[PDB]
Nucleic acid binder design. Structure first.
Lengths: 117, 144, 200, 63
RNA sequence: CUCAGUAGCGGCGAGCGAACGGGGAUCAGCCCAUUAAGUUAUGUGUGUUUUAGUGGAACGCUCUGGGAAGUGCGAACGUAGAGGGUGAUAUUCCCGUACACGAAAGGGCACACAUAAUGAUGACGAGUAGGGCGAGGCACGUGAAACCUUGUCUGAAUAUGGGGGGACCAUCCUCCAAGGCUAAAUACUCCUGACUGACCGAUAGUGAACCAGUACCGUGAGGGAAAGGCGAAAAGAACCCCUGUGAGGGGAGUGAAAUAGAUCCUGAAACCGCAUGCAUACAAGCAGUGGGAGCACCUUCGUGGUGUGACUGCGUACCUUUUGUAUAAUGGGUCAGCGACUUAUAUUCAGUAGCGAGGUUAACCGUAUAGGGGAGCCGUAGAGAAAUCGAGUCUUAAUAGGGCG
RNA sequence: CCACAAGUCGAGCAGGUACGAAAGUAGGUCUUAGUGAUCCGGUGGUUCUGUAUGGAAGGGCCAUCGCUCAACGGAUAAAAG
């Protein structure tokens, strides 16, 4: 019962190459080089799915800080004031408000400094 | 039911055989369970049984004792319960051999008290222990 | 048990031969053993020591820059010997006599339960003509079926030879695979009695 | 082929109901200096140790 | 086939390894010079089988199609529905198949009979048996070494006798060497005919599907390749044009199909061209990944889809071997194909099925996976080196004590 | 105490002893080093075995003898550059 490998092997190599398309030089043409490229891409994706949350939190904090300093407070003091006032709006929403609506962010800053004092 | 494509074996009857060196996922890939290097990793790598690395072996650092007896090979032991296989009332060496409880090449037989008997027998030219003789008499047989 | 023949009469048969419970694992083992015993197992391959040539070392061990080689018929090379050459094999298995008889009993009981076994008082052919046998089997509603008789008449054998899905056998030659393969089993009372006496 | 017995071991080991019996060493030739207690206690048979039972089983399959 | 990996042999290492007894296959005895069975060659007769061959049943319509054996409707033969072919899948189109029939001439086999030779320079076994010395063979290595052959030196008795029964002596049992012939069961396949395959399908399978033991290498012995596929049918492109009356093309024509056009079925990858869209000439590194503006096309115009990716955070390949590798430690120029835990036997444990204090056959017979075959094996009792005894047994003067059960 | 092979201490019972009036003490010496497995062979006993039978030879069992095998768990009987 002799078995030929051609069809299955070709299908596997073709699938790897198809996943590899868009890379430079031998990475998108040669199976040996392409197979390594796919695995490293997967590893980078696994690490970046975690890094993304940190990066977006840092961006939100920066925008909130800019808005707070326009309204006369630092980011840390505004966060403390909001916590004292018992406001539970998160930083993503606070940053969106800071970017798109200055009056509402000013009202929030007023509330925070009122709680501070 | 009762078709060539509807017949199945019992659960646990068949197991897939183990195949070595067919990929990472199988769990026995690459080395295939042999480990890394050394004599045992090589083809035909097992050492001779009874070899302990050079120290005098267990079977060579102990003394020889005893000798073999020829008549013991031809002596035969028979349990009491086996007499049930016997056809007829006469228990002898020939009758035991016919019943296939004693091999043909044996020259004498002994009967020991091992089981129970519910029949009457007459024993001819076969050695009996005290318990076996008592059991035969109780069952209603005789000796000689 | 009382089994009704096609005409309407009643035939008494043994419970052991036709009333045994169905043991799927036992039947599977026996049928697989028969199928395996059906194999011929004739073949071979040539190992590195059976291929023509290859006696000498192709090139010296050191200095050339190639990979070290000992023979041109090494299995790694194209045109070389097969690593593990086969030899003819015997595929017969030992089936216990009691297990074989039990499997046959189970098959007969299951056929009786499923109503694929029809008992006839008699079954014979006047002439070795296929059309008469075809008419008889159509009348019995057993066009595709296996016929079991105490003895095989030459005329019936000739008449059944060319019919597809129809074979005729003696009571002493039944086999578990043929008992299962055909849609129906047409059995005479005498064959039933003989098989009952054989208890399998 | 059939497994073959290691006759050297077969000449040193005999089978009991649940194990193997053996003789003891240090009783062959040098005996004058040895004490009477050792002389008497080294006589007779002992049992094979569990750790070494496996090798004896391998070397004596049919006993 | 068992006995049995038992009894024994062995730097008592590694290893080697019987016989008696039982079950089968086959079955057969006959002679030493008044000359046997058996064998061989020639010739005759009675049966049988081969070397060419002959006959051999039964389908129409309709639909798709280049082509029907394929669809739908109904019909016939079958001791025949094995196999191959015919423009795609045929019991009824062809070759055939079951069956019936056939030999002028030649050949093989069985038996009967008539001759030739042969058995057969052989008529009871003397340089013989036995012994000293050195070797060899028997499962057995000189070992307590019995038994067989002899290179060398010797050497009987002869049925009132002699050989063997494992050193050797006595008794008993058994047989008659130094002269011969003999079939079957057994071993094998250069060849012949038939049939078969959970054997391969052009890097496989014979080295060799093809003009292969050839081409080719070597003084020579010797070593030793690669290379199958148009189409159903050549119907293999009349004729016109460019070109050197070249090669190579374009039109026309054939064909169901011409990127089926003759290194001619399908035509993958590495590698190399042309065309379209986006990006790219102020910016430093395993070339991706998470985000993300602009542009082109398609748009159900959407919080859409397909290509491209200015700018930005993170980020030093894979395998092997190692305490530890981006390592400037090893291996890989790339692609396609091939490439490495198997098979037989024995044994041990686990799972599963049958039977159960019982379980099971081996060789073998058997128109044969059935049925028969009980020899044999495992289990059912241990103790002791052994005799021996036995639910007990060994040790001991001991019913004590203790070991193994 | 110990991987194994081995090693170490020991109440107490039966028999025969020596010394004590007696209770009693004694199974080598204050203790921890003074050593060598297996195979093969020698010697004294032995209610074991004895290749047809009776013996014998040979074998087994108890006691004991032959290694600076010191590279001292000891490749072979015998081995330098």
């Amino acid at each position: 019962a002799r078995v030929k490998r051609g069809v299955v092997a070709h299908r596997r190599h073709k699938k790897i190459l198809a996943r590899a398309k868009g890379y430079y030089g031998a990475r998108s043409r040669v199976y040996r080089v392409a197979f390594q490229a796919v695995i490293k891409a997967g590893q980078y994706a696994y690490r970046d799915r975690r890094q993304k949350k940190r990066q977006f939190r840092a961006l939100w904090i920066a925008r909130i800080n800019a808005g707070a300093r326009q309204n006369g407070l630092s980011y840390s003091r505004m966060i403390d004031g909001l916590k004292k006032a018992q406001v539970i709006i998160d930083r993503r929403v606070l940053a969106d408000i800071a970017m798109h609506d200055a009056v509402a962010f000013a009202a929030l800053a007023e509330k925070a400094k009122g709680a501070l004092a | 039911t009762l078709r060539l494509n509807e017949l199945a074996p019992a659960e646990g009857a068949k197991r897939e055989h183990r195949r070595l060196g067919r990929g990472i996922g199988s769990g026995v890939g690459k080395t295939g369970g042999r480990g890394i290097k050394g004599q045992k990793s090589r083809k035909s790598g097992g050492v001779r049984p009874g070899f302990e690395g050079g120290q005098t072996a267990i079977y060579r650092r102990l003394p020889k004792f005893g000798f073999t007896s020829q008549i013991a090979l031809k002596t035969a032991e028979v349990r009491l319960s086996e007499l049930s296989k016997v056809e007829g009332d006469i228990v002898s060496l020939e009758t035991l051999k016919a019943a296939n409880v004693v091999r043909r090449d044996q020259i004498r037989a002994r009967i020991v008290l091992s089981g129970e008997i519910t029949r009457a027998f007459t024993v001819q030219g076969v050695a009996l222990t005290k318990g076996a003789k008592a059991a035969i008499e109780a069952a209603g047989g005789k000796v000689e | 048990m009382n089994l009704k023949t096609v005409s309407g009469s009643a035939v008494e048969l043994s419970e052991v031969a036709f009333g045994r419970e169905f043991n799927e694992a036992l039947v599977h083992q026996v049928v697989t053993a028969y199928l395996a015993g059906g194999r011929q197992g004739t073949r071979a391959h040539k190992s590195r020591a059976d291929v023509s040539g290859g006696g000498k070392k192709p090139f010296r061990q050191k200095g050339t820059g190639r990979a070290r080689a000992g023979s041109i018929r090494s299995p790694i090379w194209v045109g070389g010997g097969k690593t593990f050459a086969a030899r003819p094999q015997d595929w017969s298995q030992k089936v216990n006599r009691k297990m074989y008889r039990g499997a046959m009993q189970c098959i007969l009981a299951e056929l009786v339960r499923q109503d694929r076994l029809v008992l006839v008082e008699e079954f014979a052919v006047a002439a070795p003509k296929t059309k008469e046998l075809l008419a008889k089997l159509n009348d019995l509603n057993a066009a595709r079926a296996l016929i079991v008789t105490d003895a095989v008449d030459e005329n019936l054998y000739l008449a059944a030879r060319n019919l597809p899905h129809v074979d005729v056998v003696d009571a002493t030659a039944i086999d578990p695979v043929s008992l299962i393969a055909f849609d129906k089993v047409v059995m005479s009372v005498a064959a039933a009695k003989k098989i009952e006496v054989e208890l399998g | 082929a059939k497994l073959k017995t290691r006759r050297g071991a077969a000449k040193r080991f005999k089978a009991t109901a649940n194990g193997f019996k053996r003789k003891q060493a240090f009783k062959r030739h040098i005996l004058t200096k040895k004490s009477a207690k050792r002389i008497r206690q080294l006589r007779g048979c002992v049992m094979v140790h569990v750790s070494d039972v496996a090798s004896v089983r391998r070397m004596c399959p049919y006993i």
